[PDB]
Design an enzyme around this catalytic site. Structure first.
Site, PDB file in Angstrom:
ATOM      1  N   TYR A 248      37.277  31.598  39.422  1.00  0.00           N
ATOM      2  CA  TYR A 248      37.477  31.200  38.037  1.00  0.00           C
ATOM      3  C   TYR A 248      38.453  30.051  37.830  1.00  0.00           C
ATOM      4  CZ  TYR A 248      35.151  35.648  37.775  1.00  0.00           C
ATOM      5  OH  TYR A 248      34.249  36.675  37.950  1.00  0.00           O
TER       6      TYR A 248
ATOM      7  N   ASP B 156      34.893  38.507  47.844  1.00  0.00           N
ATOM      8  CA  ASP B 156      35.432  38.436  46.494  1.00  0.00           C
ATOM      9  C   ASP B 156      36.702  39.280  46.406  1.00  0.00           C
ATOM     10  OD1 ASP B 156      35.751  39.252  43.550  1.00  0.00           O
ATOM     11  OD2 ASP B 156      34.110  37.810  43.393  1.00  0.00           O
TER      12      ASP B 156
ATOM     13  N   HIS C 241      37.601  41.226  44.053  1.00  0.00           N
ATOM     14  CA  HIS C 241      37.334  42.525  43.456  1.00  0.00           C
ATOM     15  C   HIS C 241      36.425  43.343  44.366  1.00  0.00           C
ATOM     16  CE1 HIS C 241      38.432  39.938  40.014  1.00  0.00           C
ATOM     17  NE2 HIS C 241      38.970  41.038  39.517  1.00  0.00           N
TER      18      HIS C 241
ATOM     19  N   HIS D 181      29.244  44.031  41.038  1.00  0.00           N
ATOM     20  CA  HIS D 181      29.774  45.158  40.279  1.00  0.00           C
ATOM     21  C   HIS D 181      28.704  45.943  39.533  1.00  0.00           C
ATOM     22  CE1 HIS D 181      33.913  44.171  41.119  1.00  0.00           C
ATOM     23  NE2 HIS D 181      33.784  42.961  40.607  1.00  0.00           N
TER      24      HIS D 181
ATOM     25  N   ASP E  46      37.087  37.872  23.321  1.00  0.00           N
ATOM     26  CA  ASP E  46      37.156  38.931  24.318  1.00  0.00           C
ATOM     27  C   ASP E  46      37.952  38.403  25.504  1.00  0.00           C
ATOM     28  OD1 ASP E  46      36.815  41.097  25.988  1.00  0.00           O
ATOM     29  OD2 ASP E  46      34.633  41.188  25.778  1.00  0.00           O
TER      30      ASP E  46
END
Ligand SMILES: NCCCc1ccc(C(=O)CS)cc1
Ligand SMILES: [K+]
Ligand SMILES: [K+]
Ligand SMILES: [Zn+2]
Length: 614
Positions: free
Chosen positions: A306, A173, A175, A136, A21
């Protein structure tokens, strides 16, 4: 209250993606390990109180999620890989694991343990290294690597168990934490700020309500602030301009009782998801700039990030600032890019109907008290001349100017400067002086004689000082009560009830941008002959973000309250809240806008609107 809490457990690294994925391949357990070991290698984790992790209870989970979704997730520990993959296909950018329900309960429980530690005054602040992230996840859906919304848990939990009326969530963040926004969009007690990569809605999660025009709905209108980056590559200047001209004025006017940070470090340079150019050290300042809020009660919770290397570095920067270690100097700062300035001007204009500040028109410290004055100084302070120092004092005397007390103050100034700049022994200091002229001349000249390229003078008083602002080595910020008529570009002149709000606005909108672009090696504070009692501590704490905190304050006249506040702010104690700020006098706002228009050509960090092309 003292200390910082570090909450972490290896068990939250015992779940991973089990199938192919590419969307989720970045969210790896190593993110935790690399992070913690980072704090271990630099000796930071050992200086924090290690509060253990607990599970979040079912009621705590139901504070922010539905019973149907909770029962759905509660069954994932019993599924095999095929059933887990089928379950994951039902949500967007999400994978499930046999231990992920356990680990998400642990992440939420760790967040709540941090909230309890901070609010119970057991520690000053703290960070929680958790996994999965939360910002999220929504009431009935996992989303974007998030199972449960840790920060929404924290806010609702603080409200319920501590009767807090004002909480500030800062989501840095890369996002957009749409789960938190959804959770608190109609809630004016929880103010949600978020900057995020947007690229005109083309970046995930591709939501129109991630835009700057989403200000909250209903009674919470004006308590949801979105700052969309519409271009990648945002630098330290863009982030600091967003803080100075959007987040921080709203935050200080809001006066939160608790600050919670969705600390996602995928907004740092090197991250494959954000693709921004902000160095990890910026997070030392984003942290430091928020410390005066909520009397220092700050809860930092991990979200994204990340690139393992830059992730460890940014985590170390954040914890460094949480412990009060000197923030590193940021150089090369200038104007925000045009896209960032467009985003900033748009969000300011739309929020102006709720925050009137946006409207437009077409041993750490040393103390030298007066001789004989014995004071009770905090544990991070100490008192005070040598043969070399006395020789230098005699030299400057026979060269440029017989009090013996003024000579003593000058020798103390030379000694504290030598200790601050030519040693890691002392960081900052404060000296009570008699003659302001001679003391300021000695201080500035000897600082320049020491390896101090640039000096930022901050003088509170009237009249002229013996400091030349001609060359590009000294910048003067004068806080006066008389006329300005400012002409030099290396000076910022500023001229009773609304004085607190106006001063905070001038500090966040004019002083800090110029001073950050200036990047001095030494801040030199002067206070003549007491409205400063309301704001001086906040100014000292916020201005320590420069010159690695090396600040020498000179106080002309003894004031037990002012001296106590000065030394307390210098030594790193918690600043007391100003109370909910209001509106400054319109004449003062016009004066601040005039100063900005006068200086923003030279000091690009003052800009909060895209410039006009001739
Ligand atoms: N298919 C592209 C979008 C998928 C995605 C969703 C969320 C993240 C995060 O970083 C969560 S903090 C990363 C990637
Ligand atoms: K964000
Ligand atoms: K809100
Ligand atoms: Zn993210």
């Amino acid at each position: 209250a003292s200390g910082s809490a570090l909450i972490f457990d290896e068990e939250m690294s015992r779940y991973k993606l089990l199938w192919t994925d590419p969307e989720c391949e970045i969210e790896v357990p190593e993110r935790l390990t690399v992070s913690y070991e980072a704090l271990r290698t630099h000796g930071l984790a050992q200086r924090c109180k290690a509060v253990p992790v607990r599970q979040a209870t079912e009621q705590e989970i139901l504070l922010a999620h539905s019973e149907e979704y909770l029962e759905a997730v509660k069954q994932t520990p019993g599924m095999n890989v095929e059933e887990l993959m089928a379950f994951s296909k039902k949500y967007n950018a999400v994978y499930f694991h046999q231990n992920i329900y356990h680990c998400a309960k642990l992440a939420a429980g760790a967040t709540l343990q941090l909230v309890d530690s901070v609010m119970k005054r057991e520690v000053r602040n703290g960070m929680a290294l958790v996994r999965p992230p939360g910002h999220h996840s929504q009431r009935s859906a996992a989303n974007g690597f998030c199972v449960f919304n840790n920060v929404a848990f924290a806010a609702l939990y603080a409200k319920k168990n501590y009767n807090l009326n004002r909480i500030l969530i800062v989501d840095w963040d890369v996002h957009h934490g749409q789960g938190i926004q959804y959770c608190f969009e109609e809630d004016p007690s929880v103010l949600y700020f978020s900057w995020h990569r947007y690229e005109h809605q083309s970046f995930w999660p591709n939501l129109p309500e991630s835009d700057y025009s989403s200000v909250g709905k209903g009674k919470g209108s004006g308590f949801n602030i979105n700052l969309p980056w519409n271009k990648v590559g945002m630098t330290n200047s863009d982030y600091l301009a967003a803080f100075f001209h959007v987040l921080l004025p709203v935050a200080y006017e809001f006066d939160p009782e608790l600050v919670i940070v969705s600390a996602g470090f995928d907004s740092a340079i090197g991250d494959p998801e954000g693709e921004m150019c902000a160095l990890p050290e910026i997070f030392a300042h984003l942290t430091h700039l928020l410390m005066p809020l909520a009397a220092g009660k700050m809860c930092v919770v991990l979200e994204g990030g990340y690139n393992l290397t830059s992730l460890g570095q940014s985590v170390c920067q954040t914890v460094h600032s949480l412990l009060g270690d000197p923030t590193p100097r940021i150089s090369g700062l200038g104007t925000a890019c045009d896209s960032a300035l467009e985003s900033i001007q748009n969000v300011r204009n739309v929020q102006s109907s709720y925050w009137s500040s946006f409207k437009h028109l077409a041993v750490r410290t040393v103390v030298v008290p007066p001789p004989g004055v014995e004071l009770t100084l905090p544990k991070n302070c100490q008192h005070s001349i040598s043969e070399s120092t006395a020789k230098e004092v005699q030299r400057i005397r026979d060269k440029h100017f017989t009090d013996q007390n003024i000579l003593r103050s000058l020798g103390n100034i030379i000694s504290v400067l030598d200790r601050m700049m030519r040693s890691d022994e002392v960081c900052n200091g404060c000296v009570v002086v008699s003659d302001l002229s001679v003391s300021v001349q000695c201080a500035l000249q000897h600082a320049l004689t020491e390896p101090a390229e640039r000096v930022l003078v901050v003088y509170v008083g009237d009249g002229e000082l013996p400091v030349k602002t001609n060359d590009g080595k000294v910048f003067l910020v004068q806080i006066c009560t008389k006329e300005t008529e400012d002409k030099c570009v290396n000076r910022l002149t500023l001229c009773g009830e609304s004085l607190t709000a106006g001063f905070m606005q001038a500090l966040l909108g004019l002083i800090l941008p110029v001073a950050y672009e200036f990047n001095p090696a030494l801040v030199l504070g002067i206070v003549e002959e007491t409205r400063l009692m309301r704001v001086w501590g906040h100014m000292t704490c916020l201005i320590q973000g420069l010159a690695r905190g090396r600040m020498l304050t000179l106080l002309q006249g003894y004031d037990k309250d002012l001296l106590e506040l000065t030394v307390s702010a210098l030594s790193g104690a918690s600043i007391s809240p100003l109370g909910p700020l209001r509106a400054p006098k319109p004449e003062d706002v016009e004066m601040m806008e005039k100063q900005r228009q006068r200086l923003q050509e030279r000091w690009g960090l003052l800009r909060c609107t895209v410039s006009e092309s001739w």
